[PDB]
Design a protein around this ligand. Structure first.
Ligand SMILES: [Ca+2]
Lengths: 269, 11, 98
């Protein structure tokens, strides 16, 4: 499974020392490109993309997002006038990209949002822009009259796939790498309750299975997971907690399942 | 790998 | 308007003398106008790097703040998060042994 995702944001209040327009690209959930309204240029974020792309590619990419920046700049005023709003903090969000699944076939998407709520979504099957809100009917009329659907469905099904197929090939080692996590368990006694915490430090890829084991048997009672949180170097972190009786700290163990480990690693105090 | 047609973002 | 979900953690397992990186990740919030600061005993930390700021499938924003540091005994490390959803600055303390 391989995914390509391009997300854009048009802000009214960023606010101090921050750009109003931010555009970023993703390959299998990894940041590879960045664009901001202050610098006005598309920059590489990973080593595999910069070593495999020329300046002529980035000059072409900069021109595209520069035109997209001015369209989203106009969208902030058009939507404010339509909703009859005067000033304040308003946002325009764009979600575009394609996904390659295990037959499976191709899944393409192009959807927008205003003030964190769904506005419009493109349906490649019917070749029409679906309006989610009653204020999205004037958007549907102007978008379909422009004839964008004819070129957008060809992009999401062929061009988007063609770009993603080579991006995976460029960083095949950078995406297929394995990093072993540093697992450490801790115990803290509160108001007559012993809270045990298990943390995994710097693992790659993102999928991980972390569970608790009391006296050899897996116990999910009073268990809380903080999900998968990213680090500044590309690796991932996870935090799991369990509420137990005081003095029963030695009974509990942390079961960690990852691609880097051939067998599940059991960790104790 | 952005789409050439940036007009598809019009609202 | 949605409230931010904040988590404070270190890159490597906490140990005095050894170099580490303090992280502060906020997610599930709207609007994107957020103020995140890494602090050492109330004083803002030096050499702090801010994320490019992305958003999830449910349109909710996310930002990560990381800074290179050496954990010292007696010092209290915390993260200050300011948002329009809260009428008070939320302080999330980092525990080296939890
Ligand atoms: Ca062309």
């Amino acid at each position: 499974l391989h995914t390509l995702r391009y997300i854009r944001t048009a802000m009214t209040d960023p606010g101090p020392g921050l750009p109003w327009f931010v555009d970023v690209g993703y390959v299998d959930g990894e940041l590879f490109m960045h664009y901001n309204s202050t610098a006005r240029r598309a920059v590489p974020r990973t080593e595999w993309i910069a070593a495999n792309t020329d300046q002529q590619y980035w000059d072409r990419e900069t021109q595209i997002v520069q035109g997209s920046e001015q369209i989203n700049r106009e969208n902030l005023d058009i939507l404010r006038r339509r909703y009859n709003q005067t000033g304040g903090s308003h946002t325009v969000q764009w979600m575009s990209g394609c996904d390659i699944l295990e037959d499976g076939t191709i899944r393409g998407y192009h959807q927008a949002a205003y003030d964190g709520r769904d506005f419009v979504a493109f349906d490649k099957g019917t070749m029409t822009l679906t309006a989610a809100v009653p204020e999205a009917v004037p958007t549907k009329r102007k978008w379909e009259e422009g004839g964008y659907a004819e070129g957008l469905k060809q992009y999401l099904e062929e061009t988007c796939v063609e770009w993603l197929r080579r991006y995976v090939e460029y960083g095949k080692a950078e995406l297929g790498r394995r990093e072993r996590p540093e697992v450490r368990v801790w115990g803290k006694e509160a108001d007559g309750i012993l809270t045990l915490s298990c943390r995994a430090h710097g693992f790659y890829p993102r999928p991980i299975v972390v569970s608790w084991l009391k006296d050899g048997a897996v116990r999910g009672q009073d268990a809380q997971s903080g999900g998968i949180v990213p680090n500044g170097d590309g690796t991932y972190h996870t935090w799991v907690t369990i509420d137990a009786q005081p003095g029963d700290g030695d009974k509990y163990q942390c079961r960690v399942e990852h691609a880097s480990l051939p067998q599940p690693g059991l960790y104790s105090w | 790998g952005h789409a050439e047609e940036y007009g598809a973002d019009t609202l | 308007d949605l409230t931010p979900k904040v988590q404070v953690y270190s890159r490597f397992p906490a140990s005095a003398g050894t170099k580490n990186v303090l992280n502060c990740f906020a997610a599930g919030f709207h609007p994107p106008k957020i103020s995140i600061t890494l602090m050492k005993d109330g004083v803002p930390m030096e050499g702090a790097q801010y994320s490019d700021m992305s958003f999830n499938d449910d349109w909710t924003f996310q930002r990560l703040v990381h800074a290179d540091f050496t954990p010292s005994s007696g010092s209290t490390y915390a993260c200050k998060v300011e948002h329009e959803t809260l009428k008070e600055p939320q302080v999330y303390k980092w525990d080296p042994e939890f």
